[PDB]
């Protein structure tokens, strides 16, 4: 009984991911988000341990929702005749990182460092859980404004993580790496690192660096805002044209620009209240 277990509120957003409503769990007034996905519009399907055929998104969310982390957790899900319904955490108050950057402009590097660090820890958690997000971008990151915590959303273009080549891609083209543009092939970790370079530039410059294929493959990063030399180096490293030239997650987090990160509560108190 989904209609008699959650109170359904206003529409929060819609798009390629589906339609998402604000909601409240009747059992305990817990704020939730209710995401509807049309069966007829589902690209990749998966299978649960029960054998039931569910969208890949549900499989991936179950794999990463164990415990606490910087991923929005799947609390429950339901199957309907023509759709699946997902019950997700809802931070309140919340703003997605795309809107946050639109309103604030380029972020101070101390704030970008804290946000970027938290995204790295969240992506590490996904990979440790066998999950590749494949659509890391500011639009798919929520900010819990009171806690200063970032949360990954929209695993609908993701995949099980593997070490062999990927030849399919459903994420955002302007965050996708040049080997995808040129050859329609990529490996998961180095492609993730590329999208993280795009995201970090986005944070410290106020918008993404590339809009067209020729810029993505061209391999030149122009900085439109004042950005420290250490931060420029990290970005350009993540945006290396050759995938094997890109840093690992460990090399990113050991980079000099990443040291002395703020705690999330400090981030909220200094930058978000």
């Amino acid at each position: 009984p989904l209609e008699s277990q959650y109170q359904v509120g206003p529409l929060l957003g819609s798009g390629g991911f589906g339609s998402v409503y604000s909601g409240i769990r009747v059992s305990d007034n817990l704020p939730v988000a209710i995401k509807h996905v049309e069966k007829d519009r589902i690209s990749d399907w998966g299978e649960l341990p029960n054998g039931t055929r569910v969208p890949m998104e549900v499989v991936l969310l179950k794999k990463v929702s164990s415990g606490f982390s910087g991923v929005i957790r799947l609390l429950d899900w339901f199957e309907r005749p023509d759709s699946f319904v997902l019950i997700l955490e809802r931070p309140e108050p919340v703003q997605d990182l795309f809107d946050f950057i639109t309103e604030r402009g380029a972020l101070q590097e101390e704030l970008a460092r804290s946000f970027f660090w938290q995204v790295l820890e969240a992506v590490r958690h996904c990979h440790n859980c066998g999950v590749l997000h494949r659509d890391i971008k500011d639009e798919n990151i929520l900010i819990d404004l009171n806690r200063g915590e970032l949360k990954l959303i929209d695993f609908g273009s993701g995949a099980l993580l593997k070490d062999t080549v990927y030849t399919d891609f459903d994420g955002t083209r302007v965050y996708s790496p040049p080997e995808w543009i040129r050859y329609h092939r990529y490996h998961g970790r180095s492609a993730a690192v590329w999208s993280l370079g795009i995201l970090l530039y986005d944070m410290v410059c106020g918008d993404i660096p590339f809009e067209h294929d020729e810029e993505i493959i061209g391999g030149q990063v122009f900085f439109r805002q004042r950005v420290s030399s250490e931060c420029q180096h990290l970005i350009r490293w993540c945006l290396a044209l050759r995938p094997s030239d890109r840093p690992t997650f460990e090399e990113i987090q050991n980079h000099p620009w990443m040291q002395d990160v703020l705690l999330p509560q400090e981030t909220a108190e200094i930058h978000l209240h």
């Binding site: 798009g15 390629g16 991911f17 690209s43 639109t102 971008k137 929209d154 273009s157 994420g171 106020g206």
Partner: peptide, 8 residues
């Protein structure tokens, strides 16, 4: 101008 980019 700054804009969102749909997925897919």
């Amino acid at each position: 101008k700054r804009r969102r980019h749909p997925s897919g």
